[PDB]
């Protein structure tokens, strides 16, 4: 199935994965794609914060959804 | 077309001066000035709109002092648009800010071109008035507050361009090949960073010519380092070269009018989690609406059952009379509609600040098409905020009206909760921009204000000019004082019931300051709270609040980029726990010889103008003061030749009068720009070939030309002018009554009578080219004997500089951007502004109000939940916002990780050993093998090791009867200093079946 990435400066990513996927796996697509250390990445759907021991499924992850992959800023 | 710097300088980093420019011919009319009203209206009139008109001939009332932070009691009774226009005029000289006494005349509105209708404004009239404006090319946006809840609605009209989407820096990348079919390779490993639908154009690319004339390309993303343009035979056949350009089109989009939204809504969701929510709060909020019609203009009664299920009924005759925005069998969601109803009153200063901020960022679009606005309704809720009904019952009792400011709080929480929000004892780390607004929402809630209360708040900051347009509680005589005592100053003038509650401090967090900010200070606390500008900072607060077990509300911003974070203790992972991309560093060999970006020159040049006028300076005068330093340097310097060259060349040259500062500088731009680059060429001429026989300079390595100086040139004669400047005062030579500005005549009589050395090259240089390949006694003895004796140059001093990007008199940035953008003309790259430089060598952060506002009113709806002391980590929001886009997404926060050990389960972050007293080595040993079952194998204080299982019986002996303060001193060779109260251990351990397990530190309470 395909799901979507979006980031916080609305940059729009396509991945294809399956519900067995792990999160580890996302965010190594997402390394592919972006040159992103998973170590940085903060995905974000549904009001949870997806974390690396998971699977796409334990968060109800559906084709055509949207995660976010955000930030954290420094500025204040 | 003139935009003043020197006060917009960090917002114009995020707005840019084309949008700034329109803003400045915007009149601007808000219709309400309750707090809502008063919040969307200091953040426009800080950013610079050309006016701000206020509507409200209310009477001011008590209870509207809850989240309308510019009344006073004294106020009461007459109008609030009167006394409100006067501190809005004073946020910014620059925006006129008047008062429309009457709108019975519509017919007003065309004076405006953007009207902003907030919660004051009746329904009916919200759609009469959006009519007239939509109908004239008026842009109309809506916006309401009704305790926890909220929302905002956007009509720019039938046409509205779009000029910029988001705001972010225009992609842009090299070129390594092109083919026919219009497929575009990256050069090596770089990365394009396009998206599909993207456009770009060209330049340098060689064989293609007329594909650099400006035209644009739609992007077809293959991966990511190719995209495709479509055919590009019809313009030649590429050849080597290129850098393609990121190019943002503009977009014309349509918006309905209020009318057709309430019955047909399109929605931008504030939280993907409650995305269920948005409809039915829109049919909600009309009822409160139909309500007020059907009750003389009242809402329903705070906690009311009876007025609740009136507008359960409301509600559901709304969606039979717009079926489309519940869909097909949807039910009314009655308890969502009955919290609506019962909080309908509620003033909440995080809500008001939440919306305050984004409307206020959704004005500023509308003037200026920069960014994208919000299309069309946005709801909101805090439901989460409520504390638990066992703590802090709810009821009709519980928040009724007390006669007090905090009326329409205690309306939400209860006047209990209210109370213990007035006895919290806080500490607000920073006063800045995040300081200012946060201190203004903890006057509106009298956090601190009760009798067991109080707030500190610290920063050693001093007041800047252009912290005014964003920091505001700060005037333009208020630069030069200190932060934190100003803003206490003055959240005391806007609820008094903070006078001699706050406690300013000048002093800065950290390692050093342990003593002021001690055992004792952080105990007392229940929460801190930062309001931070850098990371380091936050990592220490982060630490302390760990070992004091105190939580942590943590936020921050980037120009429209924000996000929250909450850190409760025993609950969640700390903010060290995770990790932010780090600031990727340029190699070494593209500084020096090879760069192709203005990121690099400007490097270069900030470099060199720390050692000009900084370093070199240093250097001298620690030579001349310190009669060991050449001693010193040999043994213990890195770059020693350089060191002794700098101290060398900084006496013998010693000029006696500005002109020879010019002579200096002369010779420095054709030691720079002229001969370093022939010598480079030496190496490495143009048409030099690497190993393979392929071209040496191509891709990041661009062949470079040297200068020659040419006065007319802006950049050749500003490198001469503030270069000389500063070495003058380096020297103490007065510069030319210098008030003069620099005169091109004059300098050019100076540098025609000078005889410029040619240059020679050197057959011995060898230049590094990779990283990885490696390259740099009797010439260093030389250097020594050719030093002036220091008894030579009794009382000689130096003034080295010190850096500061935001005095414009200084030079600074005049000699980096000269110095830069000469190094640029070598390179054949783009040449600078000093706008534009000052933000690379100054590392400016991009800074707006609007977004401070929304992510500190977001920070104190998570305070709520700290006073009810939630364990329920499903209950907080850590939060992530774009204003640009806008986007708006919130998550859990993460548990802290556990462990065991034997039967224990711990906290890998939250728990420790609590040691009482200066216990002996032999002791504690004994107490964690009896009470936890741990054999210790190793333990530590800092970076030395005290005891480990492995030590013979001999040394054994020496330690085991030692406390540890002792024990310390063993190892160390040092003491430890009086006023220390506590020491950390490590420790490794194995378990009752001696395996190794990860477990706990120790304090020792001494
Ligand atoms: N965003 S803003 O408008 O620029 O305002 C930000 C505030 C915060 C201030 N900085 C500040 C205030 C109080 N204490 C500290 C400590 C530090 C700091 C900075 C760098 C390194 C270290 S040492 C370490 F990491 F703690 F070990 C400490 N900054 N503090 C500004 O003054 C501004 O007003
Ligand atoms: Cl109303
Ligand atoms: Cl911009």
């Given at each position: 199935?395909?799901?979507?990435?979006?980031?916080?400066?609305?940059?729009?990513?396509?991945?294809?994965?399956?519900?067995?996927?792990?999160?580890?796996?996302?965010?190594?697509?997402?390394?592919?794609?972006?040159?992103?250390?998973?170590?940085?990445?903060?995905?974000?759907?549904?009001?949870?914060?997806?974390?690396?021991?998971?699977?796409?499924?334990?968060?109800?992850?559906?084709?055509?959804?949207?995660?976010?992959?955000?930030?954290?800023?420094?500025?204040? | 077309?003139?935009?003043?710097?020197?006060?917009?300088?960090?917002?114009?980093?995020?707005?840019?001066?084309?949008?700034?420019?329109?803003?400045?011919?915007?009149?601007?009319?808000?219709?309400?000035?309750?707090?809502?009203?008063?919040?969307?209206?200091?953040?426009?009139?800080?950013?610079?709109?050309?006016?701000?008109?206020?509507?409200?001939?209310?009477?001011?009332?008590?209870?509207?002092?809850?989240?309308?932070?510019?009344?006073?009691?004294?106020?009461?009774?007459?109008?609030?648009?009167?006394?409100?226009?006067?501190?809005?005029?004073?946020?910014?000289?620059?925006?006129?800010?008047?008062?429309?006494?009457?709108?019975?005349?519509?017919?007003?509105?065309?004076?405006?071109?953007?009207?902003?209708?907030?919660?004051?404004?009746?329904?009916?009239?919200?759609?009469?008035?959006?009519?007239?404006?939509?109908?004239?090319?008026?842009?109309?946006?809506?916006?309401?507050?009704?305790?926890?809840?909220?929302?905002?609605?956007?009509?720019?009209?039938?046409?509205?361009?779009?000029?910029?989407?988001?705001?972010?820096?225009?992609?842009?990348?090299?070129?390594?090949?092109?083919?026919?079919?219009?497929?575009?390779?990256?050069?090596?490993?770089?990365?394009?960073?396009?998206?599909?639908?993207?456009?770009?154009?060209?330049?340098?690319?060689?064989?293609?010519?007329?594909?650099?004339?400006?035209?644009?390309?739609?992007?077809?993303?293959?991966?990511?380092?190719?995209?495709?343009?479509?055919?590009?035979?019809?313009?030649?056949?590429?050849?080597?070269?290129?850098?393609?350009?990121?190019?943002?089109?503009?977009?014309?989009?349509?918006?309905?009018?209020?009318?057709?939204?309430?019955?047909?809504?399109?929605?931008?969701?504030?939280?993907?989690?409650?995305?269920?929510?948005?409809?039915?709060?829109?049919?909600?909020?009309?009822?409160?609406?139909?309500?007020?019609?059907?009750?003389?203009?009242?809402?329903?009664?705070?906690?009311?059952?009876?007025?609740?299920?009136?507008?359960?009924?409301?509600?559901?005759?709304?969606?039979?009379?717009?079926?489309?925005?519940?869909?097909?069998?949807?039910?009314?969601?009655?308890?969502?509609?009955?919290?609506?109803?019962?909080?309908?009153?509620?003033?909440?200063?995080?809500?008001?600040?939440?919306?305050?901020?984004?409307?206020?960022?959704?004005?500023?679009?509308?003037?200026?098409?920069?960014?994208?606005?919000?299309?069309?309704?946005?709801?909101?809720?805090?439901?989460?905020?409520?504390?638990?009904?066992?703590?802090?019952?709810?009821?009709?009792?519980?928040?009724?009206?007390?006669?007090?400011?905090?009326?329409?709080?205690?309306?939400?929480?209860?006047?209990?909760?209210?109370?213990?929000?007035?006895?919290?004892?806080?500490?607000?780390?920073?006063?800045?921009?995040?300081?200012?607004?946060?201190?203004?929402?903890?006057?509106?809630?009298?956090?601190?204000?009760?009798?067991?209360?109080?707030?500190?708040?610290?920063?050693?900051?001093?007041?800047?000019?252009?912290?005014?347009?964003?920091?505001?509680?700060?005037?333009?005589?208020?630069?030069?004082?200190?932060?934190?005592?100003?803003?206490?100053?003055?959240?005391?003038?806007?609820?008094?019931?903070?006078?001699?509650?706050?406690?300013?401090?000048?002093?800065?967090?950290?390692?050093?300051?342990?003593?002021?900010?001690?055992?004792?200070?952080?105990?007392?606390?229940?929460?801190?709270?930062?309001?931070?500008?850098?990371?380091?900072?936050?990592?220490?607060?982060?630490?302390?609040?760990?070992?004091?077990?105190?939580?942590?509300?943590?936020?921050?911003?980037?120009?429209?980029?924000?996000?929250?974070?909450?850190?409760?203790?025993?609950?969640?992972?700390?903010?060290?726990?995770?990790?932010?991309?780090?600031?990727?560093?340029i190699?070494?060999?593209?500084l020096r010889?090879?760069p192709?970006?203005i990121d690099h020159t400007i490097a270069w040049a900030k470099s060199l103008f720390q050692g000009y006028f900084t370093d070199?300076?240093?250097?001298?005068?620690?030579?001349?003061?310190?009669?060991?330093?050449?001693?010193?340097?040999?043994?213990?310097?890195?770059?020693?030749?350089?060191?002794?060259?700098?101290?060398?060349?900084?006496?013998?040259?010693?000029?006696?009068?500005?002109?020879?500062?010019?002579?200096?500088?002369?010779?420095?731009?054709?030691?720079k720009?002229?001969?370093?680059?022939?010598?480079?060429?030496?190496?490495?001429?143009?048409?030099?070939?690497?190993?393979?026989?392929?071209?040496?300079?191509?891709?990041?390595?661009?062949?470079?030309?040297?200068?020659?100086?040419?006065?007319?040139?802006?950049?050749?004669?500003?490198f001469?002018?503030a270069g000389?400047?500063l070495?003058?005062?380096?020297?103490?030579?007065?510069?030319?009554?210098?008030?003069?500005?620099?005169?091109?005549?004059?300098?050019?009589?100076?540098?025609?009578?000078?005889?410029?050395?040619?240059?020679?090259?050197?057959?011995?240089?060898?230049?590094?080219?990779?990283?990885?390949?490696?390259?740099?006694?009797?010439?260093?003895?030389?250097?020594?004997?050719?030093?002036?004796?220091?008894?030579?140059?009794?009382?000689?001093?130096?003034?080295?500089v010190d850096f500061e990007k935001?005095?414009?008199?200084?030079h600074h940035i005049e000699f980096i951007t000269a110095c830069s953008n000469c190094r640029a003309?070598?390179?054949?790259?783009?040449?600078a502004?000093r706008?534009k430089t000052k933000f690379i060598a100054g590392r400016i952060?991009?800074?707006?109000?609007?977004?401070?506002?929304?992510?500190?009113?977001?920070?104190?709806?998570?305070?709520?939940?700290?006073?009810?002391?939630?364990?329920?980590?499903?209950?907080?929001?850590?939060?992530?916002?774009?204003?640009?886009?806008?986007?708006?997404?919130?998550?859990?926060?993460?548990?802290?990780?556990?462990?065991?050990?034997?039967?224990?389960?711990?906290?890998?972050?939250?728990?420790?050993?609590?040691?009482?007293?200066?216990?002996?080595?032999?002791?504690?040993?004994?107490?964690?093998?009896?009470?936890?079952?741990?054999?210790?194998?190793?333990?530590?204080?800092?970076?030395?090791?005290?005891?480990?299982?492995?030590?013979?019986?001999?040394?054994?002996?020496?330690?085991?009867?030692?406390?540890?303060?002792?024990?310390?001193?063993?190892?160390?060779?040092?003491?430890?200093?009086?006023?220390?109260?506590?020491?950390?251990?490590?420790?490794?351990?194995?378990?009752?079946?001696?395996?190794?397990?990860?477990?706990?530190?120790?304090?020792?309470?001494?």
């Amino acid at each position: 199935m395909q799901i979507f990435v979006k980031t916080l400066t609305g940059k729009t990513i396509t991945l294809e994965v399956e519900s067995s996927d792990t999160i580890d796996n996302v965010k190594s697509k997402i390394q592919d794609k972006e040159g992103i250390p998973p170590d940085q990445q903060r995905l974000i759907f549904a009001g949870k914060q997806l974390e690396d021991g998971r699977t796409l499924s334990d968060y109800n992850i559906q084709k055509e959804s949207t995660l976010h992959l955000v930030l954290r800023l420094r500025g204040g | 077309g003139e935009i003043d710097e020197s006060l917009y300088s960090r917002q114009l980093y995020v707005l840019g001066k084309e949008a700034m420019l329109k803003m400045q011919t915007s009149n601007v009319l808000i219709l309400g000035l309750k707090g809502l009203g008063v919040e969307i209206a200091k953040n426009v009139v800080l950013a610079g709109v050309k006016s701000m008109t206020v509507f409200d001939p209310e009477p001011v009332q008590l209870a509207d002092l809850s989240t309308q932070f510019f009344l006073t009691e004294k106020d009461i009774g007459q109008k609030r648009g009167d006394v409100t226009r006067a501190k809005l005029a004073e946020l910014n000289a620059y925006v006129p800010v008047n008062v429309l006494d009457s709108l019975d005349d519509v017919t007003q509105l065309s004076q405006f071109q953007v009207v902003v209708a907030t919660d004051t404004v009746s329904l009916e009239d919200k759609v009469k008035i959006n009519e007239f404006c939509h109908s004239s090319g008026i842009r109309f946006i809506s916006s309401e507050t009704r305790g926890l809840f909220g929302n905002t609605f956007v009509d720019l009209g039938d046409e509205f361009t779009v000029l910029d989407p988001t705001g972010e820096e225009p992609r842009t990348g090299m070129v390594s090949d092109i083919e026919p079919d219009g497929t575009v390779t990256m050069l090596d490993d770089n990365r394009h960073g396009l998206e599909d639908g993207n456009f770009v154009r060209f330049s340098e690319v060689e064989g293609l010519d007329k594909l650099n004339d400006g035209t644009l390309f739609k992007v077809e993303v293959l991966g990511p380092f190719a995209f495709r343009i479509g055919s590009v035979k019809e313009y030649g056949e590429y050849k080597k070269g290129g850098i393609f350009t990121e190019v943002k089109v503009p977009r014309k989009i349509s918006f309905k009018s209020l009318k057709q939204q309430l019955s047909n809504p399109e929605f931008v969701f504030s939280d993907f989690a409650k995305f269920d929510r948005a409809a039915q709060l829109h049919l909600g909020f009309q009822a409160l609406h139909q309500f007020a019609v059907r009750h003389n203009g009242e809402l329903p009664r705070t906690m009311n059952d009876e007025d609740a299920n009136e507008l359960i009924k409301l509600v559901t005759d709304l969606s039979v009379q717009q079926p489309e925005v519940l869909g097909e069998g949807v039910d009314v969601n009655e308890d969502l509609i009955k919290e609506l109803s019962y909080q309908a009153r509620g003033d909440i200063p995080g809500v008001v600040a939440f919306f305050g901020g984004l409307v206020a960022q959704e004005v500023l679009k509308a003037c200026s098409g920069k960014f994208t606005p919000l299309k069309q309704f946005m709801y909101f809720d805090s439901l989460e905020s409520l504390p638990d009904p066992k703590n802090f019952p709810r009821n009709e009792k519980t928040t009724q009206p007390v006669n007090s400011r905090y009326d329409n709080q205690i309306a939400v929480f209860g006047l209990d909760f209210q109370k213990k929000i007035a006895n919290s004892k806080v500490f607000l780390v920073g006063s800045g921009a995040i300081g200012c607004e946060m201190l203004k929402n903890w006057a509106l809630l009298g956090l601190g204000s009760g009798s067991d209360g109080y707030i500190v708040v610290t920063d050693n900051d001093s007041i800047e000019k252009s912290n005014l347009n964003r920091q505001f509680l700060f005037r333009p005589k208020d630069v030069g004082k200190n932060k934190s005592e100003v803003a206490a100053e003055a959240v005391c003038a806007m609820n008094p019931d903070l006078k001699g509650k706050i406690n300013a401090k000048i002093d800065k967090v950290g390692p050093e300051t342990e003593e002021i900010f001690n055992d004792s200070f952080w105990e007392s606390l229940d929460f801190v709270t930062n309001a931070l500008d850098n990371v380091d900072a936050r990592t220490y607060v982060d630490r302390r609040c760990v070992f004091y077990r105190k939580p942590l509300l943590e936020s921050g911003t980037l120009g429209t980029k924000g996000n929250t974070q909450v850190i409760i203790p025993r609950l969640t992972e700390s903010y060290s726990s995770s990790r932010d991309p780090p600031e990727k560093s340029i190699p070494l060999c593209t500084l020096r010889s090879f760069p192709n970006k203005i990121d690099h020159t400007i490097a270069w040049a900030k470099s060199l103008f720390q050692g000009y006028f900084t370093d070199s300076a240093e250097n001298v005068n620690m030579y001349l003061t310190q009669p060991n330093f050449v001693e010193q340097t040999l043994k213990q310097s890195g770059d020693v030749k350089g060191v002794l060259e700098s101290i060398s060349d900084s006496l013998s040259s010693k000029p006696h009068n500005f002109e020879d500062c010019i002579k200096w500088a002369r010779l420095e731009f054709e030691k720079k720009f002229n001969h370093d680059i022939k010598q480079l060429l030496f190496n490495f001429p143009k048409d030099a070939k690497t190993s393979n026989g392929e071209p040496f300079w191509s891709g990041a390595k661009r062949a470079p030309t040297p200068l020659e100086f040419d006065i007319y040139n802006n950049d050749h004669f500003h490198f001469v002018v503030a270069g000389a400047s500063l070495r003058a005062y380096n020297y103490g030579i007065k510069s030319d009554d210098s008030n003069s500005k620099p005169n091109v005549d004059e300098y050019k009589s100076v540098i025609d009578h000078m005889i410029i050395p040619e240059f020679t090259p050197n057959a011995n240089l060898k230049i590094q080219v990779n990283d990885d390949d490696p390259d740099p006694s009797d010439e260093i003895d030389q250097l020594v004997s050719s030093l002036p004796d220091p008894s030579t140059l009794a009382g000689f001093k130096l003034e080295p500089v010190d850096f500061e990007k935001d005095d414009d008199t200084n030079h600074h940035i005049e000699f980096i951007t000269a110095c830069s953008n000469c190094r640029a003309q070598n390179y054949f790259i783009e040449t600078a502004d000093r706008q534009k430089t000052k933000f690379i060598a100054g590392r400016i952060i991009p800074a707006i109000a609007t977004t401070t506002s929304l992510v500190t009113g977001l920070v104190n709806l998570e305070l709520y939940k700290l006073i009810d002391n939630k364990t329920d980590i499903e209950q907080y929001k850590n939060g992530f916002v774009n204003l640009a886009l806008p986007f708006f997404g919130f998550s859990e926060p993460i548990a802290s990780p556990k462990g065991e050990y034997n039967n224990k389960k711990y906290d890998k972050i939250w728990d420790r050993f609590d040691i009482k007293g200066d216990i002996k080595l032999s002791d504690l040993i004994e107490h964690f093998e009896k009470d936890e079952g741990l054999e210790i194998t190793m333990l530590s204080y800092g970076v030395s090791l005290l005891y480990a299982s492995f030590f013979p019986p001999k040394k054994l002996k020496e330690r085991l009867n030692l406390p540890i303060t002792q024990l310390v001193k063993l190892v160390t060779k040092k003491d430890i200093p009086a006023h220390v109260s506590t020491m950390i251990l490590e420790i490794c351990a194995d378990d009752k079946e001696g395996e190794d397990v990860e477990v706990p530190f120790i304090t020792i309470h001494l």
